[PDB]
Amino acid sequence: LYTLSTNNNQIKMLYRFVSGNSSSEWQFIQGLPSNKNAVISGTNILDIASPGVYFVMGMTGGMPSGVSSGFLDLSVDANDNRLARLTDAETGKEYTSIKKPTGTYTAWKKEFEP
């Protein structure tokens, strides 16, 4: 399955195996737009609910205080456990937040410093 859009956040490739009525799930594939990690801007970072590595900037909310932009590495399992790791583009500092199936994300923990 291929979506018909020029928008890089909307052009998706998917594949699966079908047998009678049964199938695998849709295996989602993420491309690299122009060989780059996908930029996200103008959203709350806690409204990202797809796995992958994204350059996040201009985020309207949910960032760690004083972190304006960074690389976000997000993991999300079938149960909706989540692990978010954000690395701040000004400093290289990691921040982390976690979600349980039946709960929302935690606040941000920061890496320790000398």
Partner: protein, 192 residues
């Protein structure tokens, strides 16, 4: 002092009236440098300065002082159809300046026009991008006023176009509509 406008180095071939200050460095006229300062005005009232530096610096270039006179004020929308009358002739001025606005985000600005070097069309051109972390849309505005006379202005045309960032297509967002480009004031300006 008075100088006749046919003498070389006078401004714009006009006669001039003014004052002159002269000194020798430390009041020593036998050994020192000479300095000269002139401050003077022409038949149109324009003020100029002219200066001689001692230590062989000689003459600095002629410095006309930029002077301005309001020619009109109000709310001239380029979507209107009436002319407006200027309080003095454009021919007495070396530039005009207009203060203007456009519909998007309440942008305000000025545009300058050289009345001695013009097509006699006061053009306004401006654009606006979406003001958030996600939109890619762009809006364009353009319009002009004619001069029907050297003492008047009239809106010839106003238009706008949107580049829609979602479909990636341009559209006409207005033709000859008010509330798109506005001029609030027009200034006559003298320069060198």
């Amino acid at each position: 002092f008075y100088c006749q406008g046919s003498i070389a180095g006078t401004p714009k071939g006009r006669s001039i009236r003014g004052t002159i200050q002269v000194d020798y460095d430390k009041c020593d006229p036998y050994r020192a440098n000479k300095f000269v300062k002139l401050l003077f005005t022409d038949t149109e009232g324009i003020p100029y300065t002219l200066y001689y530096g001692g230590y062989n610096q000689g003459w600095k270039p002629l410095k006309q002082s930029e002077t301005s006179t309001l020619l009109w004020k109000g709310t001239l929308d380029f979507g209107s159809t009436e002319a407006v009358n200027l309080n003095d002739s454009l021919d007495n001025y070396d530039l005009i300046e207009v203060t203007y606005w456009t519909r998007s985000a309440g942008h305000f600005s000025t545009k300058r026009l050289d009345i001695k070097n013009t097509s006699n069309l006061l053009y306004i051109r401006d654009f606006n991008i979406s003001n958030d972390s996600t939109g890619s849309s762009v809006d364009f505005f353009e319009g002009y006023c004619t001069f029907p006379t050297r003492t008047s202005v009239q809106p010839g045309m106003v238009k706008s176009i949107t580049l829609d960032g979602s479909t990636n297509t341009t559209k006409v967002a207005s033709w000859n509509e008010k509330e798109r480009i506005k001029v609030y004031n027009i200034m006559g300006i003298n320069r060198g």
